[PDB]
Amino acid sequence: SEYVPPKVWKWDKANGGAFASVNRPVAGPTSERELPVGKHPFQVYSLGTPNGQKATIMLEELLQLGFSEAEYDAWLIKIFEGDQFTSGFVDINPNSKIPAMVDRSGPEPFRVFESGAILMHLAEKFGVFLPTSGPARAECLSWLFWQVGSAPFIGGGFGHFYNYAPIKIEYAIDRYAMETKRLFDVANRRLAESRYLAGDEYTIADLATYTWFGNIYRGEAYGEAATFLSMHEYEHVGRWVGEIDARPGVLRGRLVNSSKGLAERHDASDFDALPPESLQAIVKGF
Amino acid sequence: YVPPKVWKWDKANGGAFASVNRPVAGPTSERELPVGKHPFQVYSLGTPNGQKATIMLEELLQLGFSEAEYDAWLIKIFEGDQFTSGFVDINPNSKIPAMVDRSGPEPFRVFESGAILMHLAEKFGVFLPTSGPARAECLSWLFWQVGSAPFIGGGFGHFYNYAPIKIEYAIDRYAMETKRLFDVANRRLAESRYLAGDEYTIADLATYTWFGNIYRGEAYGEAATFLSMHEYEHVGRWVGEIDARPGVLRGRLVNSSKGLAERHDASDFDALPPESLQAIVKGF
Ligand SMILES: N[C@@H](CCC(=O)N[C@@H](CSSC[C@H](NC(=O)CC[C@H](N)C(=O)O)C(=O)NCC(=O)O)C(=O)NCC(=O)O)C(=O)O
Ligand SMILES: N[C@@H](CCC(=O)N[C@@H](CSSC[C@H](NC(=O)CC[C@H](N)C(=O)O)C(=O)NCC(=O)O)C(=O)NCC(=O)O)C(=O)O
Numbered sequence: 001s002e003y004v005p006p007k008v009w010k011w012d013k014a015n016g017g018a019f020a021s022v023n024r025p026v027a028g029p030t031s032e033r034e035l036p037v038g039k040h041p042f043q044v045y046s047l048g049t050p051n052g053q054k055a056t057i058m059l060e061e062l063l064q065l066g067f068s069e070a071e072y073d074a075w076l077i078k079i080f081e082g083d084q085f086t087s088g089f090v091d092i093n094p095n096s097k098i099p100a101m102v103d104r105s106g107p108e109p110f111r112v113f114e115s116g117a118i119l120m121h122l123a124e125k126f127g128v129f130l131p132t133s134g135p136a137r138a139e140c141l142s143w144l145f146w147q148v149g150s151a152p153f154i155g156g157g158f159g160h161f162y163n164y165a166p167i168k169i170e171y172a173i174d175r176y177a178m179e180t181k182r183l184f185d186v187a188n189r190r191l192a193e194s195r196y197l198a199g200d201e202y203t204i205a206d207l208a209t210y211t212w213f214g215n216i217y218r219g220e221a222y223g224e225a226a227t228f229l230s231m232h233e234y235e236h237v238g239r240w241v242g243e244i245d246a247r248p249g250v251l252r253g254r255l256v257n258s259s260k261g262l263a264e265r266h267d268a269s270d271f272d273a274l275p276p277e278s279l280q281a282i283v284k285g286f
Numbered sequence: 287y288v289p290p291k292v293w294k295w296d297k298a299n300g301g302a303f304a305s306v307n308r309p310v311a312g313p314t315s316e317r318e319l320p321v322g323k324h325p326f327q328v329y330s331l332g333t334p335n336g337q338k339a340t341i342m343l344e345e346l347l348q349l350g351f352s353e354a355e356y357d358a359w360l361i362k363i364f365e366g367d368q369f370t371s372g373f374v375d376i377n378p379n380s381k382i383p384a385m386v387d388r389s390g391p392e393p394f395r396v397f398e399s400g401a402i403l404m405h406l407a408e409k410f411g412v413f414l415p416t417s418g419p420a421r422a423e424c425l426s427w428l429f430w431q432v433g434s435a436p437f438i439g440g441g442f443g444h445f446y447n448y449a450p451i452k453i454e455y456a457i458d459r460y461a462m463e464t465k466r467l468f469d470v471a472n473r474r475l476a477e478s479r480y481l482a483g484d485e486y487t488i489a490d491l492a493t494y495t496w497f498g499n500i501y502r503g504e505a506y507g508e509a510a511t512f513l514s515m516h517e518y519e520h521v522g523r524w525v526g527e528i529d530a531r532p533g534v535l536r537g538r539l540v541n542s543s544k545g546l547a548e549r550h551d552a553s554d555f556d557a558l559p560p561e562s563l564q565a566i567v568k569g570f
Pocket of ligand 2: 145146149150300303306307333334335336363368380381382383397398399400432434435436438439440441443444
């Protein structure tokens with residue numbers, strides 16, 4: 001018979017599949033441990049998921065343009081193991097999610113958390129990948145906030161119910177597969193008539209959406225999702241993914257804090273530990 | 287059940303929203319948007335997300351910024367108004383709120399509540415530090431709100447209040463996450479008056495519309511009891527402080543069944559009984 005929710009919700013059962021070892025109804029630190037700090041002006045604490053890739057790609061894009069103040073240390077945070085709940089991590093992101101960073105480029109350090117805030121902070125600092133004024137700024141912000149507000153349906157809904165939940169729940173898989181397809185259709189309809197999401201040039205709105213959409217579209221995210229969701233239908237998404245795939249900052253940034261690349265980045269020469277081909281073409285994750 | 291190799295749109299989904307939710311985007315009717323006299327044209331509904339936009343504009347009017355005068359036209363989301371050609375042209379995602387900035391020589395769209403908040407805060411130089419570390423703190427909390435409300439509304443609200451069958455695993459997932467998010471805010475507000483510092487900013491406004499509506503018992507049936515809202519005393523303090531702001535008291539009523547269907551001039555509020563603008567009862 002049908003489940004009847006209690007009057008008062010209680011945390012009486014594991015939830016999250018593999019993530020049941022970390023998912024809780026309360027926030028805060030579970031151990032006292034300071035974060036490591038390197039020599040570079042930006043300190044990033046992350047994992048090479050689509051959200052971590054936004055941050056490390058952005059920094060590599062800035063280095064591609066010659067901005068030495070974008071040099072960074074990218075320290076590995078293993079989210080299945082609860083590294084996001086150390087006191088040091090909670091102090092830089094009260095929400096205990098990656099990516100989070102400390103801007104140590106000025107006289108006093110300060111935290112920046114949330115991938116969208118990291119992208120906007122870096123774009124504003126260096127004056128690139130985000131129009132500084134005018135209608136084009138509003139268009140870019142609209143698409144960036146769209147990405148941030150919609151990825152929860154893609155990863156927290158579809159990815160979870162399709163690939164991590166311990167039981168396959170038809171209503172939930174249908175809900176979030178449908179919504180993920182709708183979001184791809186929004187992008188596809190836009191990219192039919194515009195080279196990039198917020199205009200004719202690559203911006204942070206593209207980078208933010210690309211990490212998620214490219215990983216799903218090319219077949220590397222959530223099991224058989226690309227077949228399940230009929231990714232072939234989104235040919236304009238495919239074109240735009242292909243354009244962005246070719247950018248050197250994307251090729252480098254995708255490899256940071258990645259099981260297919262570097263565990264950590266502490267200097268530009270660190271990439272010489274990888275096969276050189278990894279810097280020249282997309283490497284799909286496991 | 288066993289998912290098929292290829293997902294097909296062959297079953298209803300969405301419960302109360304089953305008549306509007308689709309796997310495809312784009313318009314379902316040809317209709318132009320109405321346009322009024324004021325510099326900002328808002329197309330919205332007084333849900334927590336619409337309230338962000340109309341409260342922000344009312345906050346700006348409280349500060350005397352006449353360029354924040356606005357027309358707020360009603361978009362009925364259960365009726366598919368978000369899929370007219372005119373609405374899709376200002377928000378390709380077909381969600382409220384969306385806006386047209388007609389304050390300058392050429393009009394342009396702004397869509398997403400967070401982008402609307404940032405656009406207005408940057409235009410008028412208020413509710414968002416213009417530079418310095420405090421700007422980064424504000425942006426962090428604003429993006430946090432935008433990235434987490436989907437779990438509260440699209441997860442918890444959906445499965446607890448709108449889905450046709452109660453699904454234990456899904457209710458647990460999103461009840462747990464909603465409580466975690468309230469706990470993040472509660473732990474912050476234990477040590478800070480507002481989320482991003484000592485002053486009210488757009489990060490507070492964005493979070494407040496959602497958190498206050500739930501905390502006070504107004505959203506999602508018995509959710510406030512279900513989620514033990516009493517546990518979050520610092521959230522309660524902050525809700526009560528923001529509840530008292532004159533711009534909140536006005537803006538929360540715009541495009542609302544319990545207030546004004548539409549707003550086309552400041553005097554529109556005079557048509558309501560004066561009690562409508564009076565102190566919000568606590569539960570904060
Ligand atoms: N808005 C934030 C989001 C940052 C974020 O979610 N970071 C996580 C790693 S990215 S992998 C995709 C992620 N899935 C999970 O986090 C799984 C654990 C989660 N608790 C769950 O049960 O689903 C996802 O779906 N993100 C949605 C989104 O990006 O909007 C992370 O650090 N998780 C740690 C955790 O404890 O949850 C931003 O943009 O920065
Ligand atoms: N990131 C956007 C979100 C704007 C938005 O979602 N606007 C909707 C009205 S606000 S009511 C809360 C909303 N719930 C729904 O939209 C219900 C319908 C939906 N299709 C569903 O099945 O759940 C919600 O949970 N929002 C989550 C969030 O704020 O992140 C809206 O216009 N819905 C119309 C539609 O067709 O979906 C922003 O901040 O602006």
